[PDB]
C-alpha cells in the first residue's frame, strides 16, 4: 500500500516527467496496483489478473522474470537487465514502458491509468520520503 519512488526517464517527454509511484497490494505475481504521476496530474489504477501476462506473452519473454522486472520498474531503480523505453503516454493514459525486441511493437503490461488534477501533495510526500531516507542514512553514516 506504500508508495515507492520510481522516476522513469521519459525519452518522449523530457519536460513532463513521470513517477511510477506504485501503491502495490500484498501481491506481486498477480495484478498489482501501480500509481503514476507527472507533476500536475497523477495516473492511478488497479491492475487485474490474467491480463498483465497477456502482454508478457506479447513481449515473448520469460515468466518469473516478469514479476521481478515489474517490481524493479515499479519500485525504486530501473533494472539494467531489461531496460524499457519509459514511454509513459499522456496521450492515452497508458504508461507503456516496453523492450521492443526484433524491431516490433510489443507491449508489457495492461495498466488502466486515469488522469487527475492535484498530485502536488502526493509528489511532496514522495520527495519528502526520499530526503527523509537520505537524512536518516546520513545520521546512520555519522554514528557508523
Amino acid at each position: 500500500m506504500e508508495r515507492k519512488i520510481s522516476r522513469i526517464h521519459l525519452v518522449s517527454e523530457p519536460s513532463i516527467t513521470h513517477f511510477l509511484q506504485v501503491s502495490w497490494e500484498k501481491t506481486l505475481e498477480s495484478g498489482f496496483v501501480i500509481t503514476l504521476t507527472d507533476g500536475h496530474s497523477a495516473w492511478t489504477g488497479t491492475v487485474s489478473e490474467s491480463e498483465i501476462s497477456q502482454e508478457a506473452d506479447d513481449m515473448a519473454m520469460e515468466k518469473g522474470k516478469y514479476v521481478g522486472e515489474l517490481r524493479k520498474a515499479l519500485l525504486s531503480g530501473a533494472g539494467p537487465a531489461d531496460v524499457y523505453t519509459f514511454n509513459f503516454s499522456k496521450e492515452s493514459c497508458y504508461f507503456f514502458f516496453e523492450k521492443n525486441l526484433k524491431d516490433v511493437s510489443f507491449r508489457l503490461g495492461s495498466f488502466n491509468l486515469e488522469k487527475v488534477e492535484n498530485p502536488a501533495e502526493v509528489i511532496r510526500e514522495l520527495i519528502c520520503y526520499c530526503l527523509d531516507t537520505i537524512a536518516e542514512n546520513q545520521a546512520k553514516n555519522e554514528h557508523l
Binding site: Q54, D57, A60, K65
Partner: protein, 197 residues
C-alpha cells in the same frame, strides 16, 4: 502444403509417442512433420493461424504471428491434443520465454512424404560389405591353418563361419525387438535415413 513438401533429421518424445521432428523452420512458416504411426495428416502454416493460436490458445497467452514466426526462425515435455484425424498438435518447446503453446493443425501429404520418409537397400549393402570382408578371409584363415596352428589365446578360437548363420537364426527373434508401432522404438538411430538422403 507447399511449405512442407518442398521444405523437406531426427525423434521428439511426446506425451504418448516418440516421433521424428522433420521440420525446417523458416521465416515464412513452420510445419512439424510427425510420423505418429497411426494417422496421415497435413501440417500447414499461415500467418493467420499463427496469429490466432498465439492470441487465443490460452487466456494468459497473446502474441502476434510475426513474434512466433521470427523467434522460431532464430530458434521440455510435449503434450498431445489429437482427434485421430485432424491433430491439433502441441509442440511445447522452450519458445517465447514459456512452454511453447502452439497448434499444429495437422504428418504431411501421403505420397511425397511417404517417399521421403516412409518408403532400405543400404542395410543389405552393408550385408554384402561384411560378406566381402568375410568371403575370402576364410580362405586366408585356411592358409594360416595350413601354415600353422599356434595361438597364444587359443581359448578364444573357433572355425571360420559365414553370415548365413545370422541370416538363418539371427534374422529371427532379433527384428521383433523393435517391431511394434506404439510409442515407437528409438528412431534417433538409423541415420544410414538413407531414403531421406
Amino acid at each position: 502444403e507447399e511449405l512442407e513438401q518442398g521444405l523437406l533429421p531426427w525423434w521428439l518424445q511426446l506425451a504418448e509417442n516418440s516421433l521424428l521432428a522433420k521440420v525446417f523452420i523458416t521465416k515464412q512458416g513452420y510445419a512439424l512433420l510427425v510420423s505418429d504411426l497411426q494417422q496421415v495428416w497435413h501440417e500447414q502454416v499461415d500467418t493467420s493461424v499463427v496469429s490466432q493460436r498465439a492470441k487465443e490458445l490460452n487466456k494468459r497467452l497473446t502474441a502476434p504471428p510475426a513474434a512466433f514466426l521470427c523467434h522460431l526462425d532464430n530458434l521440455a515435455t510435449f503434450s498431445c491434443d489429437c482427434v485421430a484425424d485432424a491433430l491439433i498438435l502441441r509442440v511445447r518447446s522452450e519458445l517465447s520465454g514459456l512452454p511453447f503453446y502452439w497448434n499444429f493443425h495437422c504428418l504431411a501429404s501421403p505420397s511425397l512424404v511417404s517417399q521421403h520418409l516412409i518408403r532400405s537397400l543400404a542395410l543389405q549393402c552393408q550385408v554384402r560389405e561384411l560378406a566381402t570382408l568375410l568371403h575370402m578371409k576364410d580362405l586366408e584363415i585356411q592358409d594360416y591353418q595350413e601354415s600353422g596352428a599356434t595361438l597364444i589365446r587359443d581359448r578364444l578360437k573357433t572355425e571360420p563361419f559365414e553370415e548365413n548363420s545370422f541370416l538363418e537364426q539371427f534374422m529371427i527373434e532379433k527384428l521383433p525387438e523393435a517391431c511394434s508401432i506404439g510409442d515407437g522404438k528409438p528412431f534417433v538411430m538409423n541415420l544410414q535415413a538413407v531414403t531421406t538422403q
